[PDB]
């Protein structure tokens, strides 16, 4: 199973939002979106979370974005599986 | 102060159970004797229960020891029916009525002792049935009735220390006898033999003859 | 205790207790002496 | 919030993957006292404001120490029967000296050769542990008692100390180890680190027992045999077989 | 800031002193009962925690502990149910032959000839015939033993003790602070994820490991005493593998995302199991797994102690548009400070949920051998309908109470509540017009049918034989649902219910579910339902809106939520409060729900329930709903005179009790009229004469007999009316369905 296309796509769909969230491409625990939902606000430190990362990707950022990555990846893998692909 | 039913935990019931009563270790977790009048009633009840259970357990033990030497004595749990069979001319109702009438005379005597502590050592009775008092600071009446008739051999007249020691012996043996009779009833329900029978069954083989192996305690085994 | 017995003397509890006692008594009487239509003495 | 920097400087001084999991709320009340205080508290359970019931900084620390001691006992007792059977020193096949096949769970196995059946052993356990634990609890509530009432002369060693988790009287600290309060703190941190490791080990042993149906030492040996195939992922097909 | 646990230690001392003195909570109730009105107000204000304390902290703590007490009562009730199933029930006998043994779980004593009530249900047993659907529930769980019911009953008793201990502990030993209760985001996170989510997931686990192999073997047909016990199925995948082969691969497909391999027990089929007449337990397994995952996802929305998450306040404040001014500004503050607002919302949603449950359980029976149990069908539907109606009226009442007590105009300026309160006359005017129009075009249609039938002009009345009124939209929706599997539901093998259309699902010679046709009579009854619902919502809405003020009585909120009147001035102001609006809404809800259950009973006995005779379905009443329900005389004759034959002729049978209550309830209802047509003054002067009679013999009480207050007279009247009506309908339904069916 390791290295197969369902593994490539799962690891890709879990890893990509982790990159997106660090470099300000995705909303995390510091940088939220305004009421329009489309523009991202600057980082606030009101959450009270500290980390050893330079940017400040906290453990909760990792949990949230990896969880969403698994949701998206499960959806994508099962959608490709359930349409004759994969 | 004194020894408690629970070392530490001085949150023993408020000082209506101070170290004054005989047998007092602060055991009233459910507050059944908080008010003084109810506490006096409970002291009477405990002493009477201890004495009656001491009598009953001694009778049960001796009758179960005789029933092991083959003597024509039934076990304690079948003595009533055995006697009624072996004496067919007696009527259950008659025996039950007589027991309630003769017990009633003395129990009305004790009742009117509790109502008025000194009132029963006069009239037909002499004056020794007036009672020596005891708990709650009363100097007359009570569960402890001295005189030459309930204390004929004078084992609490003279030497207050000796009186206290014997009072403690009575109370502790009474509590033990009450627990023992509860054990008798429970063992008879769970096994169906006599008390001495159960004891010798256990000592003969200490294992495989516990409460687990009777099939009623641990219900599934 | 004194307050517990005072609670047991309240109308809501004592009434319910007395109704239960009288009901139980009538139920026992009808269980032992059933179907009694007249005062046959 | 932005931390306090000076407060979380001490957590960075303990080193390791700590600091990565500590928060500003935790450092408001975790200042270094209590051994094993590395600031890990993501949920603020030891917060002294609004404490009560069993959620208090004292009860929580006491329970952690009690658990670490029970878990060290349990981990040593999980490993010892199996390693002694595998070494052949004791007479039990290594698939019978496994910890969960000892009669604790009758459906999972039994060792019907005890000098009493398990239920009666549990009865005597209940009585004796009721004595021990009830005395421990009433010493926790009343921090000086249990040494006043008679107990066949045992009451001499039941005075305790300040911290209920460390009574260290005449018996609980027979060898009188750690005569320096600094050395006492160092040994306390030894005890707590070993105890937390043993908590993790005991949970792991239970999970492996469900997951592989073999002994913890047998699981370790079969993992060292072929690591790639004998692991958590490899065993995912055959789990209760 | 930062959600956390806060408690006060030992706020209250556990004594018995206050039980000795009734009325301790309320200052007005204190100082003795000078009159019997004290006795009544002692109970009327027992749980009104608002009037016992103004501190929201204390109110909240009392609510928390009262909830624990309610949970303890429910656990006592469940323990009783399971214990009666274990001891005084024919459950083990009913498992073997579920089609001919009548479920029972309550035996009576011999004491006064009441032994006759012990029905010859079956299984060599005698007892009352239960209709609570517990046997079907237990079989669906996968019990198949009377030891397991005993274990469950004892566990429920232990849990009841735990609930009562928890309530005592959290009121007297560690009581939460107010800022704990106001953490609505954390409570929502835990009730979406932890409660409903993990609960659904755990139930799916149980069904997969217990309810599915056991019920598979029972449905294959096996004496239950030979089936392996549930732990045997659970602990070795060998047995499950022989039953469900995908268990031979274990959890590897799950963590590899090859979930299709679980298709043998995670099915998407719909319809009913042909052997049991219930939904496929594989379908319900898949359902519970899916919604458990969905609720775990739902429970991560709101923000707590970490940056991620949304804020309820921020979400609410951001939904404002041109037509609403400030929109939801201030809704958050009036929801996390007033308990009655939450009570109104939760009661409304809970009653609607109960009604939805009733609907979805008659149409698509979820338990094995429950569709064929016609008594269980009818009883469960009617019970949940009545529970839903009561909860809805309670929602109206507590909306009124919040509008009277917990509403301040300072924070509700030009927001949604202010906008609604600022145009209530338009809402009420238009709703009253709708009620008029629906009442006319629903009841006048029935009266036109009656008049034309009595005149001998059936070609004029509205019926299938003449002027048709056909539910085109409902029929179109039925057809669309029928055509779904394979079209708009490609992976569904069959329709969700045999009521859309298709074939007749019959089990054991009895119909489980067959297509339901909608015609002119169905049109008429649906519009009757709309009319009654609209009048009820009009009454409750008008009460809520005019709770505070009215052009007639502007200072109404100064008189309180519950006051009788405001004198005979202004022409008479009887029943002007919000409480009296709830009082009338109770009557209208009774009328509504009663018509709903009559419609269900007649339609099911006339077009669904029956027996299959190898050539067609022979329904209980024979199909007379389609032609006779068009007229009022049809309901009085072909449903109410005709179907009452089983209740009035029940003397000397096991249903004789239903013959008594049917009569007895007729008493209570009529008795209620005493309280609803009379007024307090007559009774006060009558009691004055009675008290003179007592005085003449020195037996007057020192506590004054006082006639009931006006509010209490109305409350007693409505309570008796509802009790009598509901008991009559309950006994009639039960006797009818337990003598036929
Ligand atoms: C036509 C009606 C209508 C309108 C005009 C709006 C308008 C708005 N809503 Mg909204 N909403 C509506 C109906 C409506 N809603 C209904 C009926 C519901 C109930 C389900 C919701 C529930 C809802 C929520 C929970 C939220 C909004 C939010 C918002 C605001 C930002 C949404 C956005 O563009 O971000 C972008 C939207 C998306 C990117 C959609 C995907 C969402 C994520 C990816 C889901 C991940 C799982 C916006 C002004 C947001 C807010 O905070 O207000 C400021 C907010 O979180 N709404
Ligand atoms: C990136 C690739 C990818 C691909 C190729 C697919 C492909 C597919 N997905 Mg999928 N999905 C993906 C990603 C992908 N998905 C991701 C990232 C997610 C989020 C994790 C999802 C979440 C998802 C869900 C939840 C579902 C699918 C479903 C489906 C299948 C049918 C969709 C459909 O027609 O629904 C139906 C179209 C409709 C109009 C039905 C809507 C009617 C609703 C019930 C009305 C009620 C409204 C109410 C308010 C809600 C299809 C083969 C469906 C499925 O399970 O397949 C059987 C389905 O339920 N997907
Ligand atoms: C049902 C609602 C409910 C709610 C909302 C609360 C809420 C609270 N309780 Mg409480 N409690 C409840 C029920 C509830 N309790 C019941 C029914 C009991 C009787 C058993 C208790 C007995 C109790 C005590 C003795 C104490 C509290 C305390 C507290 C407070 C601390 C919260 C905490 O840290 O818990 C944390 C929970 C844990 C650390 C471990 C939870 C493990 C338990 C056994 C639950 C697991 C069972 C699970 C739900 C079912 C899974 C089955 C399993 C086999 C897989 C908190 C405000 C503490 C307090 O005083 O406040 C400061 C306190 O000491 N509660
Ligand atoms: C490696 C685990 C470990 C460690 C480092 C400690 C460390 C400590 N314990 Mg602790 N304890 C442990 C396990 C441990 N304990 C377990 C499992 C239990 C449950 C039985 C206890 C129960 C316990 C109590 C009740 C108390 C302590 C106390 C103490 C402190 C006293 C100093 C000391 O003697 O150190 C311990 C030195 C070592 C652990 C190194 C020795 C390692 C070997 C393997 C020990 C084997 C035991 C030995 C072979 C048995 C015979 C020896 C003896 C009878 C002659 C100290 C910080 C006392 C205290 O806090 O004083 C105030 C205190 O009251 N312990
Ligand atoms: C996983 C977390 C969790 C769970 C499972 C629950 C579950 C429940 N809560 Mg609770 N709550 C939680 C978190 C949780 N809550 C948190 C974090 C808060 C703080 C805001 C609250 C605050 C809160 C309030 C104010 C109230 C509840 C209430 C309830 C009960 C709802 C009534 C009912 O009949 O439902 C269904 C019934 C059941 C599912 C039966 C299950 C019963 C078990 C024993 C639940 C016990 C689990 C307990 C919550 C975990 C800790 C206990 C431990 C410390 C001993 C329900 C049992 C209401 C209540 O009934 O009061 C008691 C109520 O008033 N909760
Ligand atoms: C809360 C629900 C729940 C629970 C308690 C269980 C519990 C169990 N499942 Mg299971 N399962 C569930 C839901 C659940 N399942 C659902 C929804 C599905 C559908 C995807 C499955 C599908 C499934 C399969 C295919 C298998 C199991 C198996 C098992 C057993 C071994 C796994 C284990 O021991 O880890 C237990 C873990 C915990 C208790 C929690 C720690 C994490 C175990 C008793 C295996 C088995 O033994 O078959 C009988 C098996 O192969 N389950
Ligand atoms: C979760 C549900 C719920 C909760 C918690 C509450 C809570 C509350 N309600 Mg309420 N209510 C509800 C649902 C609820 N209600 C529903 C569904 C309705 C519609 C009927 C109402 C209608 C309502 C009104 C009209 C009023 C309240 C009032 C109150 C408050 C005082 C209640 C009280 O102590 O009266 C005392 C309790 C009693 C008098 C018990 C008797 C109740 C009836 C007569 C019992 C019926 C008999 C029973 C079914 C058994 C019959 C068999 C018989 C032969 C023995 C209180 C905070 C009062 C208030 O002022 O609010 C502040 C108020 O006047 N409620
Ligand atoms: C059950 C569901 C999940 C539970 C989650 C919640 C539990 C919270 C536990 C958090 C721990 C507390 C803080 C830890 C913080 C912490 O780690 O402390 C640091 C730890 C020990 O530190 P010390 O106490 O020795 O500190 C002194 C030194 O660190 C000085 O620098 O050092 C380590 O790095 C050991 C951990 C390595 C972990 C080895 C595990 C290897 C598994 C790898 C798996 C990856 C592949 C998987 C493929 C499937
Ligand atoms: C069973 C309840 C029987 C209670 C008997 C009378 C209780 C009086 C009392 O305990 O005094 C209050 C007692 C103080 O005595 P007081 O000063 O005379 O009121 O208060 C307490 O210390 C504890 C109160 C709890 C009483 C037991 C509650 C029931 C325990 C079993 C739980 C189930
Ligand atoms: C309140 C209380 C108690 C009791 C107080 C009382 C109630 C005192 C007064 C008691 C009285 C007046 C008792 C009267 C008892 C009459 C009895 C027991 C009659 C018994 C006969 C029976 C049951 C039948 C015998 C047949 C037999 C078997 C043979 C046939 O031919 C038929 C038949 C006649 C039916 C006790 C327990 C004693 C102690 C005290 O601490 C608490
Ligand atoms: C820190 C924190 C904080 C934050 O904030 C939050 C959170 C996250 C919650 C956290 C965390 C937590 C955790 C991790 C927990 C875990 C624990 C454990 C695991 C324990 C165990 C623990 C463990 C334990 C006790 C164990 C013990 C054991 C034992 C006794 C055993 C015994 C035995 C033996 C010897 C052998 C035999 O044959 C059997 C028996 C008899 C059986």
Token representation of residue B195? 């008390």
Under 8 Å between Cβ of B24 and B167: no
Tell me which residue of E679, E675, E654 sits closest to E723, measured CA to CA.
E675
Residue E215's DSSP bridge partners are: none
Q: What angle do CA B76, B81, B82 make, to 5 degrees?
A: 75
What residue has token string 């001694």?
B58
- On whether residue D43 sits in a domain, the answer given is yes
Residue in E5, E251, E255 closest to D50 by CB: E5
Phi, psi of E651 (to 5 degrees): -70, 135
Tell me which residue of D77, D47, D70, D39 sits closest to D191, measured CA to CA.
D70
Q: 3-class DSSP state for residue E153?
A: helix
Q: Is the CB of A37 under 6 A from ligand 1?
A: yes
Q: Do C30 and E112 touch (CB under 8 A)?
A: yes
* CA atoms of E633 and E654, how far apart (whole Å): 31
CA torsion through residues D123, D124, D125, D126, sign: positive
* CA atoms of E544 and D171, how far apart (whole Å): 73
Around ligand 11, the residues with Cβ closer than 6 Å are D 40-43, 45, 67, 70-71, 74, 77-78, 99, 102, 104, 199, 202-203
CA torsion through residues E422, E426, E429, E431, sign: negative
Q: Which residues contact E312 (CB under 8 A, 6 or more apart)?
A: E184, E185, E188, E302, E332
- On whether residue D90 sits in a domain, the answer given is yes
Element (H, E) at E605: helix E578-607
Q: Which of E257, E289, E298, E309 has the highest number of chain A CBs within 10 A, making it the mutation to test binding with A?
A: E257
Residues of E in contact with D107 (CB under 8 A): 231, 235
Q: At what angle do helices E710-739 and E656-677 cross, to 10 degrees?
A: 160
Token representation of residue E537? 């919502």
Q: What angle do CA E106, E110, E113 make, to 5 degrees?
A: 110
Exposed/middle/buried for E573, CB within 10 Å: 0-12, 13-18, 19+?
middle
CA of E318 to the centre of ligand 1 (A): 9
Q: Which residues contact B70 (CB under 8 A, 6 or more apart)?
A: none
Q: Do C30 and E111 touch (CB under 8 A)?
A: yes
Q: 3-class DSSP state for residue B184?
A: helix
Tell me which residue of E578, E732, E718 sits closest to E646, measured CA to CA.
E732
Token representation of residue B196? 């001495």
Tell me which residue of E385, E371, E145 sits closest to E277, measured CA to CA.
E371
> What is the interface size between A and E, counted as CB pairs within 8 Å?
32
Phi-psi region of E463 (alpha: psi -120 to 50; beta: other; left: phi over 0): beta
Q: Pairing state of beta strands E104-106 and E128-129?
A: antiparallel
Q: 3-class DSSP state for residue B74?
A: coil
Q: Which residues contact E225 (CB under 8 A, 6 or more apart)?
A: none
E184-190: Cβ within 8 A, 24+ apart: E184/E312, E184/E335, E184/E336, E185/E3, E185/E302, E185/E303, E185/E304, E185/E309, E185/E311, E185/E312, E186/E3, E186/E302, E186/E304, E188/E299, E188/E302, E188/E312, E189/E299, E189/E300, E189/E301, E189/E302, E189/E304, E190/E299
* CA atoms of B196 and B204, how far apart (whole Å): 12
* CA atoms of E222 and E243, how far apart (whole Å): 14
Number of domains forming the structure of chain D: 1
Residues of B in contact with D135 (CB under 8 A): 7
CA of E536 to the centre of ligand 7 (A): 19
Q: Which residues contact B27 (CB under 8 A, 6 or more apart)?
A: B5
**H-helix segments, B70-159:** 79-86, 92-115
Under 8 Å between Cβ of B52 and B58: no
**Interface present between D and C (3 or more CB pairs within 8 Å):** no
Nearest listed ligand to the Cα of residue D54: 3
- On whether residue D118 sits in a domain, the answer given is yes
- On whether residue D70 sits in a domain, the answer given is yes
- On whether residue D241 sits in a domain, the answer given is no
CA of D167 to the centre of ligand 3 (A): 29
Torsion angle, alpha carbons of B64, B66, B70, B73, to 10: -70
Q: Do D236 and E4 touch (CB under 8 A)?
A: no
Tell me which residue of D188, D202, D221 sits closest to D76, measured CA to CA.
D202
* CA atoms of B5 and A51, how far apart (whole Å): 55
Q: Containing domain of residue A54, as a range?
A: 1-86
* CA atoms of E395 and E401, how far apart (whole Å): 10
Tell me which residue of D195, D233, D197, D230 sits closest to D214, measured CA to CA.
D230
* CA atoms of E575 and E566, how far apart (whole Å): 9
Token representation of residue E410? 């300072």
Residue in C6, C30, C31 closest to E20 by CB: C6
Q: Do D115 and B207 touch (CB under 8 A)?
A: yes
Q: Is the CB of E668 under 6 A from ligand 7?
A: no
Token representation of residue E420? 């609604």
* CA atoms of E660 and D211, how far apart (whole Å): 61
What subunits make at least 3 CB pairs under 8 angstroms with B?
A: C, D
* CA atoms of E30 and D203, how far apart (whole Å): 58
Torsion angle, alpha carbons of B135, B137, B141, B147, to 10: 90
- On whether residue D9 sits in a domain, the answer given is no
CA of D195 to the centre of ligand 6 (A): 30
The neighbour count for residue D139, using CB atoms within 10 Å, is 20
Under 8 Å between Cβ of E610 and E619: yes
**H-helix segments, C1-41:** 2-8, 11-32
Q: Which residues contact E209 (CB under 8 A, 6 or more apart)?
A: E230, E233, E234, E240
* CA atoms of E550 and E571, how far apart (whole Å): 15
Q: Method of determination?
A: cryo-EM
Nearest chain E alpha carbon to C9: E20
Number of domains forming the structure of chain A: 1
Resolution in angstroms comes to 4.2
Q: What is the 3-state secondary structure (H, E, C) of E661-727?
A: HHHHHHHHHHHHHHHHHCCHHHHHHHHHHHHHHHHHCCCCCCCECCCCCHHHHHHHHHHHHHHHHHH
Phi, psi of A2 (to 5 degrees): -65, 130
CA torsion through residues B112, B114, B115, B121, sign: positive
Q: Containing domain of residue D203, as a range?
A: 15-236
* CA atoms of D4 and E354, how far apart (whole Å): 53
- D1 close to E (CB below 8 A): no
Phi-psi region of B2 (alpha: psi -120 to 50; beta: other; left: phi over 0): beta
**B30 annotated to bind ligand:** yes
Q: Do D107 and E231 touch (CB under 8 A)?
A: yes
Residue E618's DSSP bridge partners are: E611
């Amino acid at each position: 199973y390791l290295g197969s296309t369902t593994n490539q796509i799962m690891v890709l769909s879990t890893f990509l939002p982790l990159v997106a969230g660090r470099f300000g491409l995705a909303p995390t625990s510091t940088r939220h979106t305004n009421q329009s939902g489309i523009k991202l606000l600057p980082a606030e430190k009101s959450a009270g979370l500290v980390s050893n990362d330079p940017a400040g990707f906290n453990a909760v950022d990792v949990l949230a974005l990896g969880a969403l990555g698994h949701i998206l990846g499960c959806g994508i893998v099962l959608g490709l599986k359930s349409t004759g692909n994969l | 102060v004194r020894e408690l039913w629970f070392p530490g935990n001085k949150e023993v019931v408020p000082d209506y159970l101070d170290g004054s009563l005989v047998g007092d270790h602060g055991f009233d977790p459910l507050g059944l004797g908080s008010s003084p009048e109810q506490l006096s009633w409970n002291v009477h009840a405990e002493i009477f229960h201890g004495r009656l259970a001491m009598t009953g357990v001694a009778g049960i033990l001796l009758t179960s020891l005789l029933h092991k030497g083959g003597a024509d004595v039934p076990e304690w749990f079948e003595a009533g029916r055995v006697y009624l069979d072996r004496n067919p001319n007696v009527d259950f109702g008659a025996l039950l009525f007589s027991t309630i009438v003769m017990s009633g005379f003395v129990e009305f005597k004790r009742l009117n002792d509790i109502r008025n502590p000194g009132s029963q050592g006069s009239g037909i009775l002499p004056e020794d049935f007036k009672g020596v008092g005891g708990p709650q600071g009363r100097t007359v009446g009570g569960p402890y009735v001295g005189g030459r008739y309930f204390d004929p051999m004078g084992l609490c007249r003279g030497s207050p220390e000796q009186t206290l020691k014997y009072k403690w012996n009575e109370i502790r043996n009474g509590r033990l006898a009450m627990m023992a009779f509860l054990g008798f009833a429970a063992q008879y329900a769970a096994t169906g033999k006599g008390p001495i029978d159960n004891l010798v069954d256990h000592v003969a083989d200490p294992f495989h003859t516990t409460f687990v192996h009777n099939g009623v305690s641990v219900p599934f085994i | 205790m004194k307050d517990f017995t005072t609670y047991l003397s309240t109308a809501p509890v004592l009434t319910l207790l007395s109704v239960t006692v009288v009901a139980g008594l009538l139920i026992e009487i009808n269980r032992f002496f059933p179907d009694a239509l007249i005062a046959a003495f | 919030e932005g931390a306090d920097l000076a407060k979380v400087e001490r957590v960075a001084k303990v080193g390791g993957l700590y600091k990565n999991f500590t928060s500003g709320q935790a450092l408001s009340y975790l200042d270094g006292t209590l051994p094993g205080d590395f600031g890990f508290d993501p949920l603020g359970l030891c917060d002294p404001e609004g404490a009560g019931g069993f959620i208090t900084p004292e009860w929580l620390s006491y329970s952690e120490v009690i658990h670490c001691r029970w878990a060290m006992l349990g981990a040593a007792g999980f490993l010892a029967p199996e390693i002694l059977a595998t070494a052949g020193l004791i007479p039990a096949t290594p698939e019978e000296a496994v910890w969960f096949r000892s009669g604790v769970i009758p459906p999972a196995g039994q060792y019907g050769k005890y000098w009493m059946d398990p239920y009666s052993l549990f009865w005597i356990e209940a009585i004796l542990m009721n004595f021990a634990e009830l005395k421990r609890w009433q010493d926790f509530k009343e921090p000086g008692s249990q040494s006043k009432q008679y107990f066949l002369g045992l009451e001499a060693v039941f005075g305790g100390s300040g911290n209920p988790a460390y009574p260290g009287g005449q018996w609980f600290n027979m060898l009188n180890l750690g005569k320096t309060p600094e050395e006492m703190k160092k040994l306390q941190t030894n005890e707590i680190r070993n105890g937390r490791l043993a908590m993790i080990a005991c949970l792991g042993c239970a999970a492996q027992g469900v997951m592989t149906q073999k002994g913890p030492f047998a699981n370790l040996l079969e993992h060292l045999a072929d690591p790639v195939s004998n692991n958590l992922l490899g065993n995912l097909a055959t789990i209760l077989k | 800031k930062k959600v956390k646990i806060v408690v006060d230690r030992n706020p209250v001392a556990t004594n018995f002193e206050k039980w000795a003195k009734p009325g301790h909570f309320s200052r007005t109730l204190s100082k003795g009962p000078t009159t019997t009105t004290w006795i009544w107000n002692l109970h009327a204000d027992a749980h009104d925690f608002d009037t016992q304390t103004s501190d929201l902290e204390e109110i909240s703590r009392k609510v928390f502990s009262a909830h624990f007490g309610q949970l303890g009562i429910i656990f006592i009730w469940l323990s009783g149910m399971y214990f009666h199933g274990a001891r005084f029930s024919n459950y083990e006998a009913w498992l073997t032959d579920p089609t001919h043994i009548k479920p029972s779980a309550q035996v009576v004593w011999p004491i006064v000839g009441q032994e006759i009530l012990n029905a010859d249900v079956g299984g060599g047993f005698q007892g009352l015939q239960i209709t609570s659907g517990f046997f079907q529930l237990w079989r669906a769980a996968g019990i198949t033993s009377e030891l397991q019911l005993y274990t469950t009953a004892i566990g429920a008793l232990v849990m009841a003790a735990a609930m009562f201990f928890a309530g005592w502990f959290h009121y007297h030993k560690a009581a939460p602070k107010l800022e704990w209760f106001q953490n609505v985001e954390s409570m929502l996170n835990h009730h979406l994820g932890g409660l409903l989510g993990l609960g659904s997931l755990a139930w799916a686990g149980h069904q997969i490991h217990v309810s599915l192999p056991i019920n598979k073997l029972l449905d294959a047909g096996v004496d239950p005493k030979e089936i392996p016990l549930p732990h045997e199925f659970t602990l070795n995948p060998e047995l499950m593998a022989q039953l469900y082969p995908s268990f031979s691969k274990g959890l590897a497909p799950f963590f590899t995302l090859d979930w299709a391999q679980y298709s043998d027990f995670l099915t998407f089929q719909g319809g009913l199991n042909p052997v049991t007449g219930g939904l496929w337990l594989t379908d319900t397994v898949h359902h519970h797994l899916a919604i458990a995952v969905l609720f775990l996802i739902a429970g991560h929305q709101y923000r707590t102690n970490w940056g991620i998450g949304s804020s309820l306040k921020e979400i609410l404040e951001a939904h404002k548009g041109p037509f609403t001014g400030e929109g939801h500004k201030g809704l958050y503050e009036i929801l996390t400070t007033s308990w009655h607002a939450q009570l109104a919302i939760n009661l409304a949603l809970f009653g609607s949920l109960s009604i939805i449950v009733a609907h979805h359980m008659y149409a698509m029976p979820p338990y094995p051998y429950l569709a064929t149990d016609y008594g269980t069908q009818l009883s469960l539907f009617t019970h949940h309908m009545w529970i839903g109606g009561f909860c809805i009226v309670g929602a109206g009442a507590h909306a009124a109470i919040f509008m009277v007590r917990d509403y301040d105009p300072t924070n509700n300026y030009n927001n949604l509540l202010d906008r609604v309160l600022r145009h209530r006359d338009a809402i009420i005017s238009h709703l009253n017009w709708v009620c008029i129009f629906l009442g006319f075009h629903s009841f006048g249609l029935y009266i036109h049918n009656d008049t034309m039938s009595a005149l001998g002009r059936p070609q004029d009345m509205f019926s299938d034989t003449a002027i048709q009124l056909q539910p085109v939209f409902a029929q179109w929706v039925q057809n669309t649902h029928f055509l779904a599997p394979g079209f708009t539901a490609p992976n569904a093998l069959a329709s969700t219910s045999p009521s859309w259309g298709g074939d007749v699902v019959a089990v054991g010679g009895k119909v489980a579910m067959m297509p339901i046709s909608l015609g002119t009579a169905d049109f008429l009854v649906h519009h009757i339902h709309a009319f009654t619902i609209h009048v009820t919502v009009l009454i409750l809405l008008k009460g809520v809106l005019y709770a505070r003020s009215s052009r007639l009585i502007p200072d109404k909120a100064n008189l309180g939520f519950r006051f009788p009147c405001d004198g005979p001035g202004r022409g008479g102001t009887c029943q002007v409060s919000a409480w009296d609006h709830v009082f009338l809404g109770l009557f209208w809800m009774y009328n509504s729900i009663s018509i709903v259950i009559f419609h269900f009973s007649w339609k099911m006995q006339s077009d669904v329930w029956g027996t299959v005779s190898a050539n067609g379905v022979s329904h209980i009443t024979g199909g007379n709903f389609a032609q006779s329900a068009n007229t009022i005389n049809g309901w009085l004759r072909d449903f109410l005179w005709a179907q009452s034959s089983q209740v009035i002729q029940s003397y000397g049978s096991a249903l004789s009790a239903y013959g008594l209550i049917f009569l007895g309830a007729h008493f209570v209802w009529a008795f209620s009229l005493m309280f609803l047509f009379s007024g307090r003054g007559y009774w006060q002067e009558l009691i004055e004469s009675i008290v003179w009679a007592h005085n003449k013999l020195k037996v007057a009480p020192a506590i004054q007999p006082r006639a009931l207050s006006i509010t209490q007279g109305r409350a007693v009247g409505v309570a008796h009316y509802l009790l009598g009506g509901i008991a009559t309908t309950w006994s009639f339904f039960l006797a009818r369905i337990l003598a036929v069916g």
